[PDB]
């Protein structure tokens, strides 16, 4: 209509003016006197073998010892990182898996992909095997990410520009989140599991409200698709990884942009983003087979985790911040320290 | 120095590894094909002759084939196209009768141009199927081909026109030094496309073996 041709522009202009008036200083100016972190050297402590195809996702258990990896060979493997033993090996009905998750309690795992169905597996059964507890349907596009809120809830992001909250007991969509104009690629949950953020292909990110079901904030500033997102450990900031070879830091309270981590020698896109236990480091896997460690408070590179022969697709940090595990398209998993 | 439980866990892990290796060896000898198309272009007919992703299994001459159909995916292709980076061949279906309807031939040109020059399919052969043979002949018996092709100059006969679509489709493959595209005409009742696909996949397998040996 004629009204929307000016109302949206006026609202955007008002938001931009509020942001401009709210930016008194910059992060670099305040954290210019802080001492540098220094060079960070990490060595490959363990190497996990057994996958026969590209690895697309992985997750860490709450105990900081067990992890689950997903690959397009039709298998879901649970590893014991301390001894590199295979606790379980779940065979998937559909081999086009694109994501996986680990329940906080440790009883269930989830996976999904091009089949538009999120499958939930029960690990602790009296029969001694692993069986599919529930299969969720309703998404009209490929499923990109899934995270466990508790033992009876799960949040999924699909390629049909929607995110939904499920109820595992019944299988019905409890709430649906809309507003994006492109494929949603990843999401991360807040520490208190009351809010979460999603990164879509429309070069934007949003802050939802699980209890209510409405977008409370929208963040822009990128120039291409967004492939990764992660919350700061404090819970008042998050980082994004785009295809324009640039990671950025956004703050919920200020509703602004804080930093940008880019270098001339890097032109490839970012596939994963994660933080350290105290949030002083920011790791990110790239398409150039490397994984740079960024000083999150000064935007200076501190080290590189070279040693992968193909694209790095997944990246995670244990809950105690003791080790970093990366997975690449060469069907190998490495634990750094 | 391991205890009893640790030794038993190691034994279980070794058994899991053996099962994984056996499964990988079993699944590494199957032929994988990705079935593309512009929609309503004889894909159903081709499937007859042999939510999300759809898989079809058929056996020919003691060889197990897998066909993946991604027609139902309405999302962005740039995100999930890299999954099928290890497919042995790509099957493309284009309807000939749609030459004078709306323009669809130009959409097929665009789809073929996008697919054939992707950064992932730089060495993957493409099998091209042209459908609606008799229908196309019946249509060209009255409707000239110049409506679809403003620059065409030739006889209004099936033999000339069919070859003209052939060269225009094959010209888009501007990577002739590594990829070879195999083309075949077909209709509602042929009962010979299985042999053509078998020949194409045998050629691809021979070339892959030669590359693996380093001979060529």
């Amino acid at each position: 209509l004629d009204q929307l041709r000016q109302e949206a522009e006026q609202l955007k202009n008002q938001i931009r003016d509020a942001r401009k008036a709210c930016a008194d200083a910059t992060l670099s100016q305040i954290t210019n006197n802080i001492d540098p972190v220094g060079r960070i050297q990490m060595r490959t402590r363990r190497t996990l073998r057994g996958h026969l195809a590209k690895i697309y996702a992985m997750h860490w258990g709450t105990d900081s010892r067990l992890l689950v990896s997903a690959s397009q060979d039709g298998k879901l493997i649970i590893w014991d990182s301390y001894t590199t033993n295979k606790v379980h090996a779940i065979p998937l009905r559909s081999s086009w898996v694109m994501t996986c998750a680990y329940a906080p309690s440790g009883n269930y795992v989830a996976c999904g992909g091009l089949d538009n169905i999120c499958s939930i597996y029960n690990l602790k059964t009296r029969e001694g095997n692993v069986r599919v507890s529930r299969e969720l349907a309703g998404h009209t596009g490929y499923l990109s990410c899934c995270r466990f809120l508790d033992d009876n809830q799960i949040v999924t992001s699909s390629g049909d520009t929607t995110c939904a909250l499920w109820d595992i007991e019944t299988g019905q969509q409890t709430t649906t989140f809309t507003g994006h104009t492109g494929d949603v690629m990843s999401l991360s949950l807040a520490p208190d599991t009351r809010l979460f953020v999603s990164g879509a292909c429309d070069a934007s990110a949003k802050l939802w409200d699980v209890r209510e079901g409405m977008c409370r904030q929208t963040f822009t500033g990128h120039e291409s698709d967004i492939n990764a997102i992660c919350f700061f450990p404090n819970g008042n900031a998050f980082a994004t990884g785009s295809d324009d070879a640039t990671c950025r830091l956004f703050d919920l309270r200020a509703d602004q942009e804080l930093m940008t981590y880019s270098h001339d020698n890097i032109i490839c896109g970012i596939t994963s983003v994660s933080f350290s236990k105290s949030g002083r480091l920011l790791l990110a896997g790239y398409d150039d087979f490397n994984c740079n460690v960024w000083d999150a408070l000064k935007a200076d590179r501190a080290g590189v985790l070279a040693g992968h022969d193909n694209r790095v697709s997944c990246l995670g940090v244990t809950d105690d911040g003791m080790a970093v595990a990366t997975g690449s398209w060469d069907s190998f998993l490495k634990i750094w320290n | 120095t391991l205890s009893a439980e640790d030794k038993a866990a190691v034994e279980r892990s070794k058994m899991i590894d053996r099962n994984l290796r056996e499964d990988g060896e079993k699944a590494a000898r199957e032929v994988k094909l990705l079935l593309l198309g512009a929609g309503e272009s004889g894909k159903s007919t081709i499937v007859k002759q042999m939510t999300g992703i759809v898989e079809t299994h058929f056996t020919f001459k003691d060889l197990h084939f897998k066909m993946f159909d991604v027609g139902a995916q309405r999302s962005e292709r740039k995100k999930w196209i890299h999954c099928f980076e290890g497919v042995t061949a790509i099957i493309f279906c284009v309807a000939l009768s749609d030459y004078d309807l709306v323009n669809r031939m130009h959409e097929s040109m665009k789809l073929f141009d996008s697919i054939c020059n992707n950064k992932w399919f730089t060495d993957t052969s493409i099998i091209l199927f042209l459908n609606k043979k008799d229908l196309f002949e019946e249509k060209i018996k009255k409707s000239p081909l110049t409506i679809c092709y403003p620059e065409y100059a030739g006889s209004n006969t099936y033999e000339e026109a069919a070859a003209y679509i052939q060269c225009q489709f094959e010209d888009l493959n501007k990577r002739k030094d590594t990829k070879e595209i195999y083309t075949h005409f077909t209709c509602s009742t042929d009962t010979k496309n299985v042999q053509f696909v078998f020949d194409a996949v045998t050629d691809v397998i021979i070339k892959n073996n030669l590359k693996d040996c380093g001979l060529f």
Epitope: N85, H88, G128 | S3, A4, E5, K7, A8, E11, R12
Partner: single-chain antibody
Framework: DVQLVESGGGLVQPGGSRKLSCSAS????????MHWVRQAPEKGLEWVAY????????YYADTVKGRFTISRDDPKNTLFLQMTSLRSEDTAMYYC??????????????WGQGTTLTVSSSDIVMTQATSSVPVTPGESVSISCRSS???????????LYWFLQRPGQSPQLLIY???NLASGVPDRFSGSGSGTAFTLTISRLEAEDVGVYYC?????????FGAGTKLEL
Amino acid sequence: DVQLVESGGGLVQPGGSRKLSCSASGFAFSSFGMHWVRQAPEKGLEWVAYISSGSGTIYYADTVKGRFTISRDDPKNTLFLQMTSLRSEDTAMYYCVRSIYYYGSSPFDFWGQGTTLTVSSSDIVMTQATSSVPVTPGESVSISCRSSKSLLHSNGNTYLYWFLQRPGQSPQLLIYRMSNLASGVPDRFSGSGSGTAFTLTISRLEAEDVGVYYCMQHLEYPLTFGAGTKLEL
């Protein structure tokens, strides 16, 4: 449901032979390791033999080593114990026990039913030193089991298990690794202690908890059970 049924009992003459079978139904038999545990009349339990998953590892008690044979047949879910040249000292009930070993697993989870085998005519020592304890309902009870060699391994795990046998019933797992609680067990039971000195505690002693308690070690594969502490009243 999960259940194990055994058969093959009866009277045997000295020096003879007999075959025992264990029929399993309700779980993944091929993914479990199977044990054979016998119990002489009023003389506590005693480990006999063990066969791993895939039949890749077999162990025997030295008292029957070279005399008994154990085998499994995954096709039809049956476990066999072939014994030849038996003597009068082998008269006892025989139990069929399952166990799966992985990180965080619960071995010795489920026990069989037992078949009578009436017949006519290094080595870690676990001690309980208690015979009977008369206790009224509603109180709290404590049971102490002591071993010879410390059971705390380098990994930090302390391999000690607690079992309870109700009158005329198969033993049930209660606590594994001296701190975990088996599934289906009420929270009243609790385990604690240090190396070489363990102790199990019951908070609210109620009915159906009367029986005999045994403590087992799982560090050195020759397994020894405790003498058994009986609970009366």
